[PDB]
């Protein structure tokens, strides 16, 4: 799990819109966006994919 050029295949989600429940998997690429009123996210600044 350590490449000389870096690992890009794996991904990680730092933050999510809503809270969680035990034993839950999310399958949505929805976005993290500052406060309220989401952005929905397509690689731009002051929101968060």
């Amino acid at each position, epitope marked *: 799990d350590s490449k000389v050029g870096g690992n890009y295949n794996y991904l990680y989600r730092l933050f999510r819109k809503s809270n969680l429940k035990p034993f839950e998997r999310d399958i949505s690429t929805e976005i993290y966006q500052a*406060g309220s009123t989401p*952005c929905n996210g397509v690689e*731009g*600044f*002051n*929101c968060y*994919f």
Partner: antibody
Amino acid sequence: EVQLVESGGGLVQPGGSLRLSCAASGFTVSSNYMSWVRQAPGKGLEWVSAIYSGDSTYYADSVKGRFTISRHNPKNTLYLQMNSLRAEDTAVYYCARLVGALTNIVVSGDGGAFDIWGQGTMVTVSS
Amino acid sequence: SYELTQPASVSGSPGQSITISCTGTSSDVGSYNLVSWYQQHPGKAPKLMIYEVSKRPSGVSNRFSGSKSGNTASLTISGLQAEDEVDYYCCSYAGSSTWVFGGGTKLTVLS
């Protein structure tokens, strides 16, 4: 140090192409702003260049199949391979900024503040 | 090719208040908000003076304001000086994170 500089200016003839460039200095283009405002003196303006990377469906129904452009984040410079340049595009563009909502500047609000520009280049498409 | 109605010729005496508008439609009345007003000395890139219509720009003199209702407008430019003979525009939404704005109100300061 932090400044948007336009470069790559040359003569364009009908049937040819040219690679423009807007280079950011100080702040890397990987996580910064770029808005291409196209200005013709005396009349209204238009923001056209739709390149927010990730390559998904986001485009304006006016320049379909005309303006093609690429992304290069680590080099802190963007290149504009504006193909099929029309002779009725006599205008000096400016790459600029904006404001969103994430960081300390907005915790509650909307954003949208173009605040830092370039100086523009002088490219004329003449027969 | 997309262009909205603005009052091009506006003028006011120094120390007075003037109103600046830019037109939308009924698809813009329910519950959005995105309006930021411009400022241009002609011949160069614009300047930011008003955004987030009824709230605070970071460094800006607080003599300017904006007001919002229905089809009844105001960019309220008050405390006019000799340096206010500049071009003005707004910003606005067009649906699904798209954008449009108005046709360049030009202010001329008399006296």
